[model samples]
Target: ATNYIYTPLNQLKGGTIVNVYGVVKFFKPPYLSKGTDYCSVVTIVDQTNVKLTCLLFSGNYEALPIIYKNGDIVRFHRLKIQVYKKETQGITSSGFASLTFEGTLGAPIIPRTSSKYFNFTTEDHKMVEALRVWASTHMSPSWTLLKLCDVQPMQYFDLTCQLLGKAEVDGASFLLKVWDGTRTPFPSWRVLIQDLVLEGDLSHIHRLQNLTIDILVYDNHVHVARSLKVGSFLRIYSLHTKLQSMNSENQTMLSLEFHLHGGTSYGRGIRVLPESNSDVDQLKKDLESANLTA
Candidate 1:
């Protein structure tokens, strides 16, 4: 019951509502606006190599595209084009609808959408495939994939790993136990919380407790941490790591601590990545190796 024409990112014109497809070059998750809506800003590019900045606003969180990582494909319908900062930009029109898909080459194509129902015929699938192929060769996304072994002190990096468990430490801070199938070089800081309150498999937690790192999500990032599902793959951007001294039981212990501080600066945020990612494939293999070694 739906038919739409897709516009290339370079061909977008001002004052027109049209459908468009892009590879997500960068994105900021939805944050509350001064007005009544939640606002999200995403920068996308097509085969034309031009970037289109889309400002999406919605009343409901589910209504926005759940973009997990850079390079995911997104299709927007009824997007209003406008001029901003002397460049063409996209904004949501009254009937804006969107569909997202994994950008992994040679992976099964599936549409991730918030809409209740939409048409996905052979042509649409074919087009998505074409874009995926083009993006694989044409785009080089800027992101640092740092494993626990590669982390250095006082550096900000991105992490892709499995969420082993989570706990609400305080109203403003949340604790996440995550592992990437690799162990940190230094002793990582561990948080003491009630065992009954942590959300995860006890056996898996016991096995990974040594390899896992405790990430203290502070302030604004806590909202995203609260909804994360245990055992899901996640990409944490701009994660801050540093050396700190803790005093406990008449002792001063120096340890490596991971903190996701408050603020969107440096693209600091967390989102769940689909299991089909190649990184996940490698991570799973490493996890298996770790299990065998034990």
Candidate 2:
């Protein structure tokens, strides 16, 4: 595997196979396209912000949660790099190259031509150290973000809430109205993600709460979610100040839209954890108390 020279992502060029390490910026769930062709995606960003996506093609799908898990560092070695300069008309997109893994050391389908195995053991001491430092300074998690009325635009934090209305299914994106028990169905916002690349199945859509606040998830896979219930728990991280089309109480403020995807860091990089957590659990209690009082 280490036969070819490992090159930094920024120095990536030509058709030569190179090696690079990147942080899991986002994790795209497996989807069947053109029928029964299942594959998973891992978007990684280098320290300099350059990105490269590794495709677990058709056979390398077995490395789930071990090698390709979000937040874990990846070192793609001796890979074919296909440069992409696709033009975008709207906001932006991956423009980064795609890296495919042929399954290391034999064991998958297609008679296992190439091989791939999860590089879990901490052997890359130097690279691992670099990843940790980079993560602490750049990819660190923000679990203590504020949750209150108006969801100020400059504050960075986490939000645990329940869905209020039925979600509007857009192309990879979903329009969800959420309530943090702040005012229950009163002051929710439109959560725009990179895409619904969540890990599980999506629940049925139901109800509505007129929310307009916006959030932007970058190169990340937010659990577009497996469950979309009227009052199910949802925990979001790295939610910075969400902007609206315009700021005002009477105007029709619109957030960009949910599209970004990634794993939760306890950080804003974007990750939708499994349905229930202690944060939402406590919030549920508060809601119960309010109900009892009211």
Candidate 3:
């Protein structure tokens, strides 16, 4: 655990590794650089509204912020600040790390990062809270929070759900059985796996079979999925929905297959949400009511 001291944008200077917080003014996703590593750029502003553009380079995507949109809040630790072209710029240093959050006021205050561990104190919470309020007056972009009931075939969407269970399908793929207490319009494709290996309540599994969806996480995302605890709440970004033709028992039918494809493009990732999150609170309530009636 570490306590980070965040520097204001106005107080930033050159030749130092500093901790800072800001609202993302604009961002470009990671792409291959002329060199070996991937590079991403982000421009951020704080209360002073002075923009600090951060140039980050990493060997892999996990080391950078998985920013989904502009207006999101970001906290950087050990960011190297240097003056370039008479303007101060931020760049990734040896220990550079980041925590990103949704800009929506009522959204969860969860940090979306690949780091295994980081300290999140009340001070950090207050900073993020203040940034959200500060960003409200400036400007905004819109992102729709889609539910299972609203998902359409051949569409990419975001989903908030509870992890029912997970299983290793193969080296390149993983299976996550999840539900949001709402059933989709079409049946979801099921992967046959041993019940003993499926880490979830049997009763919950059997009851929610019709409502649950099996998400096939691939490549880089498979590693992240393996560490997700069953029963944890998750916010899956840019999930793709596809229709697959399968023979069930004796009939051929189209089943909806969900996939978290192999890259960080379009903010594709899995994030675990704390129980205290407003979204998780409602999801818990929804599941509880469904359980009572089951």
Best by lDDT: 1
**By how many angstroms RMSD does model 2 differ from the true structure?**
11.2
Where model 1 places Cα greater than 4 Å from the true spot, the runs are 1-3, 32-36, 141-143, 191-207, 243-254, 274-282
Candidate 2 weakest lDDT stretch, 10 residues? 87-96
In order of appearance, the predictions have TM-scores of 0.83, 0.42, 0.67
Q: Write the per-residue lDDT of candidate 3 for residues 1-294, one digit (tens) a residue.
A: 666678899998899889999998766566556698877888999999788999999997768886766688999989999998998999999978889998888777989888988778988988899999999987665454677888889998878899988888777998999998888888998876666777778787888887889999998788778888989999887899998887878899988999999877666777677776667888899888776676
RMSD of each: 3.5, 11.2, 6.4
The per-prediction tally of clashing pairs is 0, 32, 0
Residue-by-residue lDDT tens digits, candidate 2, 1-294: 433345676776655555566667665444333444444566677678776665544433332222222455555544556555651111112221222221212212111112344333334445556665676577655334445453554455556655544333444444445445454122334453343432222332211223222333332232343344545665555455444466677777544333224443323332333333335557778656544444
* Residue 219, model 3, lDDT: 88
Q: Could you arrange the candidates by TM-score from highest to lowest? A: 1, 3, 2
Best by TM-score: 1
Taken over the whole model, the C-alpha lDDT of each candidate is: 0.85, 0.44, 0.84
Look at candidate 1 and give me any clashing residue pairs. none
